[PDB]
Design an enzyme around this catalytic site. Structure first.
Site, PDB file in Angstrom:
ATOM      1  CB  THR A 159      24.128  -2.764  15.921  1.00  0.00           C
ATOM      2  OG1 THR A 159      24.510  -2.166  17.167  1.00  0.00           O
ATOM      3  CG2 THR A 159      25.364  -2.926  15.039  1.00  0.00           C
ATOM      4  CG  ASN A 180      20.176  -5.582  17.291  1.00  0.00           C
ATOM      5  OD1 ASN A 180      20.673  -5.493  16.143  1.00  0.00           O
ATOM      6  ND2 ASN A 180      20.537  -4.785  18.294  1.00  0.00           N
ATOM      7  CG  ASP A 261      27.020  -0.630  21.462  1.00  0.00           C
ATOM      8  OD1 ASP A 261      25.924  -0.042  21.548  1.00  0.00           O
ATOM      9  OD2 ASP A 261      27.113  -1.860  21.543  1.00  0.00           O
ATOM     10  CG  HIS A 265      25.191  -2.069  25.797  1.00  0.00           C
ATOM     11  ND1 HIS A 265      23.820  -1.910  25.855  1.00  0.00           N
ATOM     12  CD2 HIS A 265      25.513  -2.128  24.486  1.00  0.00           C
ATOM     13  CE1 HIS A 265      23.337  -1.873  24.628  1.00  0.00           C
ATOM     14  NE2 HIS A 265      24.343  -2.013  23.781  1.00  0.00           N
ATOM     15  CG  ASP A 308      25.696   1.630  15.339  1.00  0.00           C
ATOM     16  OD1 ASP A 308      26.138   2.371  16.243  1.00  0.00           O
ATOM     17  OD2 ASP A 308      25.539   0.401  15.517  1.00  0.00           O
ATOM     18  CG  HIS A 309      22.952   2.840  17.942  1.00  0.00           C
ATOM     19  ND1 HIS A 309      23.671   2.840  19.120  1.00  0.00           N
ATOM     20  CD2 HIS A 309      23.160   1.632  17.370  1.00  0.00           C
ATOM     21  CE1 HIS A 309      24.259   1.664  19.274  1.00  0.00           C
ATOM     22  NE2 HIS A 309      23.963   0.910  18.224  1.00  0.00           N
ATOM     23  CG  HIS A 420      21.648   1.329  21.564  1.00  0.00           C
ATOM     24  ND1 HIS A 420      21.334   0.576  20.453  1.00  0.00           N
ATOM     25  CD2 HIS A 420      22.683   0.698  22.167  1.00  0.00           C
ATOM     26  CE1 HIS A 420      22.181  -0.434  20.355  1.00  0.00           C
ATOM     27  NE2 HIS A 420      23.003  -0.386  21.389  1.00  0.00           N
ATOM     28  CG  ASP A 687       2.546   1.306   0.448  1.00  0.00           C
ATOM     29  OD1 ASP A 687       1.975   2.392   0.740  1.00  0.00           O
ATOM     30  OD2 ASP A 687       2.476   0.820  -0.688  1.00  0.00           O
ATOM     31  CG  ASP A 691      -3.782   3.774   0.113  1.00  0.00           C
ATOM     32  OD1 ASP A 691      -2.613   3.339   0.209  1.00  0.00           O
ATOM     33  OD2 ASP A 691      -4.615   3.749   1.043  1.00  0.00           O
TER      34      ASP A 691
HETATM   35  C1  LIG Z   1      11.933   3.131  -0.028  1.00  0.00           C
HETATM   36  O1  LIG Z   1      12.640   2.755  -1.207  1.00  0.00           O
HETATM   37  C2  LIG Z   1      12.323   1.473  -1.692  1.00  0.00           C
HETATM   38  C3  LIG Z   1      13.258   1.127  -2.850  1.00  0.00           C
HETATM   39  O2  LIG Z   1      12.970   1.931  -3.970  1.00  0.00           O
HETATM   40  C4  LIG Z   1      10.840   1.379  -2.083  1.00  0.00           C
HETATM   41  O3  LIG Z   1      10.528   0.010  -2.172  1.00  0.00           O
HETATM   42  C5  LIG Z   1      10.187  -0.431  -3.492  1.00  0.00           C
HETATM   43  O4  LIG Z   1       8.858  -0.055  -3.822  1.00  0.00           O
HETATM   44  C6  LIG Z   1       8.192  -0.672  -4.921  1.00  0.00           C
HETATM   45  C7  LIG Z   1       6.690  -0.338  -4.847  1.00  0.00           C
HETATM   46  O5  LIG Z   1       6.064  -0.997  -3.755  1.00  0.00           O
HETATM   47  C8  LIG Z   1       8.434  -2.195  -5.007  1.00  0.00           C
HETATM   48  O6  LIG Z   1       8.030  -2.634  -6.290  1.00  0.00           O
HETATM   49  C9  LIG Z   1       7.417  -3.948  -6.256  1.00  0.00           C
HETATM   50  O7  LIG Z   1       8.401  -4.940  -6.522  1.00  0.00           O
HETATM   51  C10 LIG Z   1       7.964  -6.270  -6.770  1.00  0.00           C
HETATM   52  C11 LIG Z   1       9.192  -7.122  -7.061  1.00  0.00           C
HETATM   53  O8  LIG Z   1      10.014  -6.969  -5.930  1.00  0.00           O
HETATM   54  C12 LIG Z   1      11.157  -7.839  -5.967  1.00  0.00           C
HETATM   55  O9  LIG Z   1      12.232  -7.332  -6.749  1.00  0.00           O
HETATM   56  C13 LIG Z   1      12.841  -6.139  -6.257  1.00  0.00           C
HETATM   57  C14 LIG Z   1      13.866  -5.614  -7.272  1.00  0.00           C
HETATM   58  O10 LIG Z   1      15.016  -6.433  -7.353  1.00  0.00           O
HETATM   59  C15 LIG Z   1      13.406  -6.385  -4.845  1.00  0.00           C
HETATM   60  O11 LIG Z   1      14.011  -5.225  -4.318  1.00  0.00           O
HETATM   61  C16 LIG Z   1      12.285  -6.863  -3.911  1.00  0.00           C
HETATM   62  O12 LIG Z   1      12.794  -7.101  -2.606  1.00  0.00           O
HETATM   63  C17 LIG Z   1      11.742  -7.136  -1.606  1.00  0.00           C
HETATM   64  O13 LIG Z   1      11.307  -8.444  -1.258  1.00  0.00           O
HETATM   65  C18 LIG Z   1      12.313  -9.307  -0.726  1.00  0.00           C
HETATM   66  C19 LIG Z   1      11.651 -10.598  -0.259  1.00  0.00           C
HETATM   67  O14 LIG Z   1      10.753 -11.041  -1.249  1.00  0.00           O
HETATM   68  C20 LIG Z   1      13.115  -8.691   0.437  1.00  0.00           C
HETATM   69  O15 LIG Z   1      14.370  -9.337   0.560  1.00  0.00           O
HETATM   70  C21 LIG Z   1      13.361  -7.182   0.307  1.00  0.00           C
HETATM   71  O16 LIG Z   1      13.686  -6.669   1.585  1.00  0.00           O
HETATM   72  C22 LIG Z   1      12.168  -6.440  -0.312  1.00  0.00           C
HETATM   73  O17 LIG Z   1      11.078  -6.495   0.588  1.00  0.00           O
HETATM   74  C23 LIG Z   1      10.435  -5.217   0.783  1.00  0.00           C
HETATM   75  O18 LIG Z   1       9.552  -4.825  -0.265  1.00  0.00           O
HETATM   76  C24 LIG Z   1       8.431  -5.677  -0.488  1.00  0.00           C
HETATM   77  C25 LIG Z   1       7.656  -5.171  -1.702  1.00  0.00           C
HETATM   78  O19 LIG Z   1       8.294  -5.618  -2.880  1.00  0.00           O
HETATM   79  C26 LIG Z   1       7.558  -5.771   0.771  1.00  0.00           C
HETATM   80  O20 LIG Z   1       6.564  -6.759   0.594  1.00  0.00           O
HETATM   81  C27 LIG Z   1       8.405  -6.098   2.010  1.00  0.00           C
HETATM   82  O21 LIG Z   1       7.654  -5.908   3.186  1.00  0.00           O
HETATM   83  C28 LIG Z   1       9.680  -5.254   2.110  1.00  0.00           C
HETATM   84  O22 LIG Z   1       9.350  -3.941   2.500  1.00  0.00           O
HETATM   85  C29 LIG Z   1      11.583  -8.094  -4.516  1.00  0.00           C
HETATM   86  O23 LIG Z   1      12.412  -9.233  -4.446  1.00  0.00           O
HETATM   87  C30 LIG Z   1       6.969  -6.313  -7.925  1.00  0.00           C
HETATM   88  O24 LIG Z   1       6.535  -7.640  -8.132  1.00  0.00           O
HETATM   89  C31 LIG Z   1       5.791  -5.394  -7.594  1.00  0.00           C
HETATM   90  O25 LIG Z   1       4.863  -5.374  -8.668  1.00  0.00           O
HETATM   91  C32 LIG Z   1       3.568  -5.906  -8.276  1.00  0.00           C
HETATM   92  O26 LIG Z   1       2.783  -5.024  -7.481  1.00  0.00           O
HETATM   93  C33 LIG Z   1       2.438  -3.790  -8.110  1.00  0.00           C
HETATM   94  C34 LIG Z   1       1.479  -3.034  -7.191  1.00  0.00           C
HETATM   95  O27 LIG Z   1       1.848  -1.674  -7.146  1.00  0.00           O
HETATM   96  C35 LIG Z   1       1.830  -3.972  -9.517  1.00  0.00           C
HETATM   97  O28 LIG Z   1       1.875  -2.751 -10.222  1.00  0.00           O
HETATM   98  C36 LIG Z   1       2.551  -5.041 -10.350  1.00  0.00           C
HETATM   99  O29 LIG Z   1       1.815  -5.335 -11.516  1.00  0.00           O
HETATM  100  C37 LIG Z   1       2.768  -6.307  -9.524  1.00  0.00           C
HETATM  101  O30 LIG Z   1       1.487  -6.822  -9.195  1.00  0.00           O
HETATM  102  C38 LIG Z   1       1.473  -8.255  -9.004  1.00  0.00           C
HETATM  103  O31 LIG Z   1       1.844  -8.647  -7.689  1.00  0.00           O
HETATM  104  C39 LIG Z   1       1.032  -8.091  -6.656  1.00  0.00           C
HETATM  105  C40 LIG Z   1       1.634  -8.394  -5.281  1.00  0.00           C
HETATM  106  O32 LIG Z   1       2.264  -9.661  -5.286  1.00  0.00           O
HETATM  107  C41 LIG Z   1      -0.412  -8.580  -6.809  1.00  0.00           C
HETATM  108  O33 LIG Z   1      -1.261  -7.917  -5.904  1.00  0.00           O
HETATM  109  C42 LIG Z   1      -0.919  -8.307  -8.228  1.00  0.00           C
HETATM  110  O34 LIG Z   1      -2.216  -8.844  -8.388  1.00  0.00           O
HETATM  111  C43 LIG Z   1       0.074  -8.804  -9.299  1.00  0.00           C
HETATM  112  O35 LIG Z   1       0.135 -10.217  -9.341  1.00  0.00           O
HETATM  113  C44 LIG Z   1       6.282  -3.969  -7.283  1.00  0.00           C
HETATM  114  O36 LIG Z   1       6.755  -3.338  -8.454  1.00  0.00           O
HETATM  115  C45 LIG Z   1       9.906  -2.555  -4.749  1.00  0.00           C
HETATM  116  O37 LIG Z   1      10.078  -3.948  -4.660  1.00  0.00           O
HETATM  117  C46 LIG Z   1      10.387  -1.947  -3.438  1.00  0.00           C
HETATM  118  N1  LIG Z   1      11.783  -2.311  -3.195  1.00  0.00           N
HETATM  119  C47 LIG Z   1      12.359  -2.568  -2.010  1.00  0.00           C
HETATM  120  C48 LIG Z   1      13.833  -2.919  -2.000  1.00  0.00           C
HETATM  121  O38 LIG Z   1      11.767  -2.532  -0.934  1.00  0.00           O
HETATM  122  C49 LIG Z   1       9.937   1.950  -0.988  1.00  0.00           C
HETATM  123  O39 LIG Z   1       8.612   2.151  -1.465  1.00  0.00           O
HETATM  124  C50 LIG Z   1      10.468   3.257  -0.415  1.00  0.00           C
HETATM  125  N2  LIG Z   1       9.655   3.698   0.687  1.00  0.00           N
HETATM  126  C51 LIG Z   1       9.113   4.929   0.717  1.00  0.00           C
HETATM  127  C52 LIG Z   1       8.290   5.273   1.919  1.00  0.00           C
HETATM  128  O40 LIG Z   1       9.296   5.770  -0.165  1.00  0.00           O
HETATM  129 CA   LIG Z   2      25.371  -0.508  17.532  1.00  0.00          CA
HETATM  130 CA   LIG Z   3      -0.273   3.022   0.419  1.00  0.00          CA
HETATM  131 CL   LIG Z   4      14.998  -5.514  18.211  1.00  0.00          CL
HETATM  132 ZN   LIG Z   5      24.603  -1.621  21.739  1.00  0.00          ZN
END
Ligand SMILES: *[C@@H]1O[C@H](CO)[C@@H](O[C@@H]2O[C@H](CO)[C@@H](O[C@@H]3O[C@H](CO[C@H]4O[C@H](CO)[C@@H](O)[C@H](O[C@H]5O[C@H](CO)[C@@H](O)[C@H](O)[C@@H]5O[C@H]5O[C@H](CO)[C@@H](O)[C@H](O)[C@@H]5O)[C@@H]4O)[C@@H](O)[C@H](O[C@H]4O[C@H](CO)[C@@H](O)[C@H](O)[C@@H]4O[C@H]4O[C@H](CO)[C@@H](O)[C@H](O)[C@@H]4O)[C@@H]3O)[C@H](O)[C@H]2NC(C)=O)[C@H](O)[C@H]1NC(C)=O
Ligand SMILES: [Ca+2]
Ligand SMILES: [Ca+2]
Ligand SMILES: [Cl-]
Ligand SMILES: [Zn+2]
Ligand SMILES: Cc1cc(-c2n[nH]c(=O)n2C)c(C(C)C)cc1Cl
Ligand SMILES: Cc1cc(-c2n[nH]c(=O)n2C)c(C(C)C)cc1Cl
Ligand SMILES: [K+]
Ligand code: NA
Length: 806
Positions: A159, A180, A261, A265, A308-309, A420, A687, A691
């Site tokens: 959900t 969940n 849902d 169940h 949702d599903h 589900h 990710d 890479d």
């Molecule tokens: C699907 O779509 C989404 C959305 O577009 C794509 O995800 C984006 O991808 C970007 C590339 O990876 C990523 O950009 C990074 O953001 C960092 C700042 O992030 C914060 O701010 C944003 C914007 O407001 C916010 O959305 C973020 O929220 C994340 O984290 C919080 C918790 O902290 C969570 O609540 C939230 O769910 C979200 O988590 C998710 O993303 C993070 C990655 O950010 C994962 O770790 C989690 O598992 C989870 O999936 C943040 O609050 C920014 O700092 C990064 O920049 C650093 O790294 C790059 C390396 O490429 C470098 O160029 C920079 O210089 C910098 O480097 C420095 O830090 C490094 C690591 O700490 C370190 O190694 C270096 O040495 C340096 O010190 C980077 O720009 C963006 O945040 C996410 N956004 C979201 C919402 O997920 C996604 O890719 C898509 N997927 C596909 C398959 O296409």
């Molecule tokens: Ca549901």
């Molecule tokens: Ca990668």
């Molecule tokens: Cl679960």
């Molecule tokens: Zn259910």
């Protein structure tokens, strides 16, 4: 603490949240133990029910009633939804013929057509057809609006992951609601369905639609209803909000139903008890549509009916127990059910070993109903790995089954008959989409699509710029009459080199050998033309892919194939070839078995070498353009070029060889020719994104040859299969895969057998969208076709699922 002795007088379902210890009157105060003393009395009225009756018509307003039938009710915005039907001789919305809504027909002061999202929990896709007799309102929405045969949820098909994906356009891995139930090791905190913790904001990443709207000056109704608030009151509240003054009235609203849902169940997806829940949801849709009609909004508002599903038959006796496989079953924590997630019970345990847990759960029983994975080895189409909240060990559970730790967990936690959460391609997990209103198309069926795409569309419907998300904006333009988003192709960042012959054979010291010295202006001029790209129109049907990052690469032309060769990764990024229906499969001649030939277009310094492969006892090699599919004995020599070679584990070569020798020809026979693009993928940090060179964790021993984590192929042909792939005048058809490049075939329990009994099964599991391959490669495909860009975006989002008919 909340000082709950304030009043909800004139504040019922207020839109702005008041900060404690001021008492709240919003539709989520119940869940916070924070409502004012008089919330129930004032805001949750029930007197006299939900429907007008003949005798109530023209009554004197009694403010105690749940809803009203007095003359003043329409301008007060609080009639029972059937008011005009019972008292004014009007018809129910469902009884009116549908008429095309060509333009929004809204009251003065409406700046844009409102959006109402009507979400239904556990609404399986086949309910649309199977429950059609008892759902006339929903059936009218479906037939007169825009509908898909089904909508694909995200994994896991639970959900919150799905509702929040609806709100954000993000994969659960990105938005953070990965199940969940969750443990977050950084926070050191747990998220549960019951409890207060789920309301903490730190769990919810990304930017949901209500925030996107608010930041751009568009007002939003709430996206949470307290469970005990009845559906009739949720509808009346939305209709009341729609009667607010222009400057106070929201443009976006959400309704949510816990049904079907909840009953699903208990009774299973098609339990006879399921008819009533479907009847009751329909009646709610009816009340909404009658209420909108009353307010002159039924040809103004866009309505999205979305689930949702789905729901699957699952019972207690179909549970696998980890206690039947593991000996140390008490050293693990399992998140159980329709998926499994395992972690160490204690971080202080240095004897915990994931490798021995995986091995103990792998192919241990003949009909085993789950399969263990390290999360980075899960099918990439699931996008289920890049979050600290997803445990390294994952169990994909067969449809219809549960996994649990010990038997006592199942009887001292049969009750339930439905569940589900399974793999999101499973038919029973599919859910619904209908769009109805001025901005959607009239009486239109669209192909099935993924729920990750709706966020962009809802932004389009409300004139909002969407936050960065995982939708492909424009892929759903065909759902819309107006407000389409006109995307442009991304700009190519790196232009290719076109190398000619620049190196003599003797400059290479690669340790490669080939029996090719076995040697005319007929075929010498002819081979020159092929190397200059004379056959390129046959093998590159949709233009060369664009490289969307900074790198150094060469286009290489050949009789039978074209490639984009990376001087950085020392192998092609892509290899493109067309195989006609008439094409012939040949074998690798004996004298050419171990043949690898230097490419006189590419420097020794930017080439692979055969010695590295000889020295690396684990790593062998394969070819991207298959030698088996050479057009002639002479062209075959081209397939053995060192620039067509890629590193491959012997275990993986079994898979790849079968694909190249058997399946390509089979597809070309079935599809009337296929264009194939193949290549490597490197995703060591799982990710989902290409890479950089500095992220590679494995090289062919003693070399700078990087080892791909995966191999892809994109396989394209004419949708009208009466036309050959290379002479197609219209729409395209595609299937693709992203195969994991693994050193064993442990994933496939029947791999000791002939490849004809297990390989294709593996490939189907790892089916993929072109878009998935795009993210993973930084490449952009289908650049040069005769098709509109939005149609190509839809093509790129297509997933071939191999399921049977819904
Ligand atoms: C699907 O779509 C989404 C959305 O577009 C794509 O995800 C984006 O991808 C970007 C590339 O990876 C990523 O950009 C990074 O953001 C960092 C700042 O992030 C914060 O701010 C944003 C914007 O407001 C916010 O959305 C973020 O929220 C994340 O984290 C919080 C918790 O902290 C969570 O609540 C939230 O769910 C979200 O988590 C998710 O993303 C993070 C990655 O950010 C994962 O770790 C989690 O598992 C989870 O999936 C943040 O609050 C920014 O700092 C990064 O920049 C650093 O790294 C790059 C390396 O490429 C470098 O160029 C920079 O210089 C910098 O480097 C420095 O830090 C490094 C690591 O700490 C370190 O190694 C270096 O040495 C340096 O010190 C980077 O720009 C963006 O945040 C996410 N956004 C979201 C919402 O997920 C996604 O890719 C898509 N997927 C596909 C398959 O296409
Ligand atoms: Ca549901
Ligand atoms: Ca990668
Ligand atoms: Cl679960
Ligand atoms: Zn259910
Ligand atoms: C469980 C749940 C949590 C939250 C929630 N609380 N905090 C947060 O960021 N979210 C997203 C919401 C929103 C609409 C308020 C709704 C629900 Cl059903
Ligand atoms: C449609 C929708 C409904 C809900 C929702 N969940 N529960 C509830 O009452 N509503 C309204 C949510 C929550 C998870 C933020 C998001 C969306 Cl996009
Ligand atoms: K080797
Ligand atoms: Na095996």
């Amino acid at each position: 603490w909340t000082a709950t002795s304030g009043s909800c007088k004139g504040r019922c379902f207020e839109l702005q949240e008041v900060g404690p210890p001021d008492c709240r009157c919003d539709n989520l105060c119940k869940s916070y133990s924070s409502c004012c003393h008089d919330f129930d009395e004032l805001c949750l009225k029930t007197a006299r029910g939900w429907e007008c009756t003949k005798d109530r018509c023209g009554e004197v307003r009694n403010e105690e009633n749940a809803c009203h039938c007095s003359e003043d009710c329409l301008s007060r915005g609080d009639c029972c939804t059937n008011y005009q039907v019972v008292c004014k001789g009007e018809s129910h919305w469902v009884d009116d013929d549908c008429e095309e809504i060509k333009v929004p027909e809204c009251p003065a002061g409406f700046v844009r057509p409102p959006l109402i999202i009507f979400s239904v929990d556990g609404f399986r896709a086949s309910y649309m057809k199977k429950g059609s007799k008892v759902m006339p309102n929903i059936e009218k929405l479906r037939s007169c609006g825009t509908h898909a045969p089904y909508m694909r949820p995200v994994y896991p098909t639970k959900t919150f992951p799905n509702l929040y994906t609806l709100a954000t356009g993000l994969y659960p891995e990105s938005h953070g609601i990965v199940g969940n139930s969750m443990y977050d090791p950084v926070f050191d905190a747990s998220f549960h369905l019951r409890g207060r913790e789920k309301f903490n904001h730190r769990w919810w990443g990304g930017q949901p639609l209500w925030i996107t709207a608010t930041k751009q000056g568009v007002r939003a109704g709430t996206f949470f209803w307290s469970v005990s608030i009845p559906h009739e009151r949720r509808i009346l509240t939305i209709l009341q909000w729609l009667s607010l003054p222009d400057n106070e009235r929201p443009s976006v609203y959400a309704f949510y139903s816990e049904q079907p849902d909840f009953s699903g169940h208990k009774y299973g997806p098609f339990g006879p008890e399921m008819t009533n829940p479907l009847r009751e949801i329909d009646k709610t849709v009816g009340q909404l549509m009658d209420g909108l009609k009353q307010l002159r909004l039924h040809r103004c508002v866009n309505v999205i009916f979305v689930g949702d599903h789905g729901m699957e038959d699952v019972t207690c006796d179909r549970t696998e127990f980890l206690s039947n496989y593991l000996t140390n079953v008490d050293d693990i924590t399992l998140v159980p059910g329709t998926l499994g997630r395992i972690r160490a019970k204690s971080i202080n345990n240095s004897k915990y070993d994931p490798k021995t847990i995986i091995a103990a759960l792998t192919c241990k029983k003949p009909d085993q109903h789950f399969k263990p994975y390290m999360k980075q080895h899960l099918p990439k189409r699931l996008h289920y790995a890049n979050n600290r909240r997803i445990e390294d060990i994952h169990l994909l559970v067969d449809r219809r089954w549960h996994v649990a730790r010990k038997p006592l967990d199942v009887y001292k936690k049969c009750f339930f008959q439905g569940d589900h959460g399974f793999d999101n391609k499973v038919n029973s997990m599919q859910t619904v989409f209908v769009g109805y209103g001025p901005t959607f198309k009239y009486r239109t069926k669209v192909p099935p699509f993924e729920n990750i795409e709706l966020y962009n569309v809802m932004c389009d419907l409300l004139g909002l710029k969407p936050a960065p998300n995982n939708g492909t904006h424009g892929s759903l333009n065909h759902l819309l009459r107006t407000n389409t988003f006109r995307p442009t192709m991304p700009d190519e960042v790196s232009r290719p080199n076109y190398p000619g012959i620049m190196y003599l054979q003797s400059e290479f010291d690669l340790g490669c050998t080939c029996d090719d010295k076995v040697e005319n202006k007929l075929e010498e001029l002819n081979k020159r033309l092929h190397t200059k790209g004379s056959t390129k129109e046959r093998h590159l049907l949709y233009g060369r892919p664009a490289v969307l990052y900074r790198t150094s690469y060469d286009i290489l032309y050949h009789t039978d194939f074209e490639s984009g060769y990376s001087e950085i990764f020392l192998m092609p990024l892509w290899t493109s070839y067309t195989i006609s229906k008439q094409a012939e499969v040949s074998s690798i001649p004996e004298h050419l078995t171990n043949c690898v030939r230097p490419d006189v277009r590419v420097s020794p310094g930017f080439s692979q070498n055969c010695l590295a492969y000889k020295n690396d006892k684990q790593m062998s090699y394969g070819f991207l353009f298959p030698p088996y599919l050479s057009s002639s004995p002479e062209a075959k020599y081209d397939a053995f070029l060192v620039t067509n070679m890629v590193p491959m584990y012997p275990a993986f070569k079994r898979v790849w060889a079968y694909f190249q020798r058997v399946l390509v020809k089979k597809y070309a026979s079935e599809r009337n020719g296929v264009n194939v693009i193949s290549g490597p993928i490197f995703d060591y940090n799982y990710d989902g994104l290409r890479d950089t060179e500095d992220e590679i964790k494995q090289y062919v021993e003693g070399s700078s040859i990087p080892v791909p984590t995966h191999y892809y192929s994109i396989i394209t042909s004419c949708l009208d299969f009466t036309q050959p792939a290379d002479k197609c005048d219209g729409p395209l058809s595609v299937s693709s895969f992203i195969l994991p490049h693994r050193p064993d075939n442990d994933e496939s329990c029947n791999s000791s057998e002939d490849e004809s009994k297990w390989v294709e099964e593996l490939m189907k599991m790892h089916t993929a969208r072109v878009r998935d391959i795009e993210h993973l490669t930084g490449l952009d495909f289908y650049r040069k076709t005769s098709r509109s860009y939005s149609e190509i975006l839809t093509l790129k989002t297509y997933l071939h699922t191999y399921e049977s008919e819904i």
